[PDB]
C-alpha cells in the first residue's frame, strides 16, 4: 500500500523504505556494466536516480518530460489493465508510491517504485522508444478486450523482456529485465533460454509464464523495428498469428 502525495507533489518516505531502495539500487548498478543497452544507462542517469532516497516523482517527471514529453503519475498498488494503458495512452507512466519489503526483495509480482522508476522509465528517455511505448498504449483502444490478451503478450515480450543484438553485442532493453538482478544475468549470459528475431506474428504465437526466469527472449536490431511494427496495422499480424496456431510451451 501507497503512500498520498501532498499538494506539491512529495511523498514522506521514511529511512527504511529508503534503505531497501538502497540495497536494490546498489545491487543492480553493479550488474548493469555489459547488459543493459546504451539508451537505458543514460536514461538513469538522465533521470537524476540517486541510489541513496526513493525518488520524488515532480523532479523525475519534470527531467523525463523535457527529453520526449513523458511524465510520472503516482498511483496506487493495483490498477488494471486499462488504466495502465489510459495513462500511457495520455503519456504518463504510472508509479505505485510504495517499494517491495525486506521479505520480499529477489522477486515479486506485483511491480513497485523500484520496478517502475529504475526498470521502465529510463528507456522512456529514448525518442523513438518513448514514441512506440505511446502508440502502442494508443493502438491498445482501437482493440476490443478480446485482443488485448495478446497485445499483453507482444508488450511482455518488447517493454518487459525484450533484447537488442547491438554492434557490442546482446543487451537488454526490457523494464523486466533491468529490474530483477537474475533476470539480468541470465537473459544475456546463460545458455538455457531460446532468443528469437523479433518478428511480429511469432511473438503474438507464443505463450509466457509470468513467475519463471524467461525461456524465451525476442531480439530486435534497433528500437526502429518497434516503431515499424506499430505503425503498420496490428490487427493483421493478430490475425494470422491465431491462424497459425499458437505454438507449444517451452516452460511447464
Given at each position: 500500500?501507497?503512500?498520498?502525495?501532498?499538494?506539491?507533489?512529495?511523498?514522506?518516505?521514511?529511512?527504511?523504505?529508503?534503505?531497501?531502495?538502497?540495497?536494490?539500487?546498489?545491487?543492480?548498478?553493479?550488474?548493469l556494466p555489459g547488459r543493459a543497452c546504451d539508451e537505458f544507462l543514460s536514461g538513469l542517469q538522465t533521470l537524476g536516480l540517486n541510489?541513496?532516497?526513493?525518488?520524488?516523482?515532480?523532479?523525475?517527471?519534470?527531467?523525463?518530460?523535457?527529453?520526449?514529453?513523458?511524465?510520472?503519475?503516482?498511483?496506487?498498488?493495483?490498477?488494471?489493465?486499462?488504466?495502465?494503458?489510459?495513462?500511457?495512452?495520455?503519456?504518463?507512466?504510472?508509479?505505485?508510491?510504495?517499494?517491495?519489503?525486506?521479505?520480499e526483495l529477489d522477486y515479486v509480482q506485483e511491480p513497485d517504485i523500484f520496478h517502475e522508476l529504475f526498470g521502465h522509465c529510463p528507456?522512456?528517455?529514448?525518442?523513438?522508444?518513448?514514441?512506440?511505448?505511446?502508440?502502442?498504449?494508443?493502438?491498445?483502444?482501437?482493440?476490443?478486450?478480446?485482443?488485448?490478451?495478446?497485445?499483453?503478450?507482444?508488450?511482455?515480450?518488447?517493454?518487459?523482456?525484450?533484447?537488442?543484438?547491438?554492434?557490442?553485442?546482446?543487451?537488454?532493453?526490457?523494464?523486466?529485465?533491468?529490474?530483477?538482478?537474475?533476470?539480468?544475468?541470465?537473459?544475456?549470459?546463460?545458455?538455457?533460454?531460446?532468443?528469437?528475431?523479433?518478428?511480429?506474428?511469432?511473438?503474438?504465437?507464443?505463450?509466457?509464464?509470468?513467475?519463471?526466469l524467461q525461456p524465451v527472449y525476442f531480439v530486435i536490431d534497433s528500437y526502429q523495428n518497434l516503431y515499424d511494427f506499430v505503425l503498420?496495422?496490428?490487427?493483421?499480424?493478430?490475425?494470422?498469428?491465431?491462424?497459425?496456431?499458437?505454438?507449444?510451451?517451452?516452460?511447464?
Amino acid at each position: 500500500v501507497a503512500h498520498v502525495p501532498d499538494a506539491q507533489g512529495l511523498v514522506d518516505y521514511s529511512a527504511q523504505e529508503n534503505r531497501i531502495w538502497n540495497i536494490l539500487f546498489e545491487r543492480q548498478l553493479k550488474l548493469l556494466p555489459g547488459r543493459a543497452c546504451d539508451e537505458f544507462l543514460s536514461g538513469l542517469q538522465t533521470l537524476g536516480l540517486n541510489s541513496s532516497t526513493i525518488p520524488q516523482l515532480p523532479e523525475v517527471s519534470e527531467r523525463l518530460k523535457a527529453k520526449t514529453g513523458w511524465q510520472v503519475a503516482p498511483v496506487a498498488a493495483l490498477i488494471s489493465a486499462r488504466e495502465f494503458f489510459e495513462l500511457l495512452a495520455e503519456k504518463y507512466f504510472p508509479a505505485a508510491t510504495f517499494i517491495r519489503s525486506e521479505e520480499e526483495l529477489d522477486y515479486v509480482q506485483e511491480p513497485d517504485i523500484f520496478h517502475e522508476l529504475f526498470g521502465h522509465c529510463p528507456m522512456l528517455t529514448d525518442r523513438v522508444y518513448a514514441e512506440f511505448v505511446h502508440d502502442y498504449a494508443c493502438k491498445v483502444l482501437t482493440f476490443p478486450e478480446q485482443d488485448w490478451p495478446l497485445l499483453q503478450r507482444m508488450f511482455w515480450f518488447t517493454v518487459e523482456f525484450g533484447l537488442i543484438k547491438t554492434p557490442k553485442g546482446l543487451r537488454a532493453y526490457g523494464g523486466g529485465i533491468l529490474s530483477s538482478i537474475s533476470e539480468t544475468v541470465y537473459c544475456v549470459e546463460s545458455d538455457i533460454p531460446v532468443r528469437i528475431l523479433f518478428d511480429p506474428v511469432v511473438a503474438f504465437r507464443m505463450p509466457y509464464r509470468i513467475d519463471q526466469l524467461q525461456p524465451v527472449y525476442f531480439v530486435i536490431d534497433s528500437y526502429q523495428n518497434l516503431y515499424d511494427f506499430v505503425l503498420s496495422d496490428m490487427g493483421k499480424f493478430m490475425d494470422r498469428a491465431r491462424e497459425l496456431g499458437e505454438l507449444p510451451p517451452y516452460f511447464d
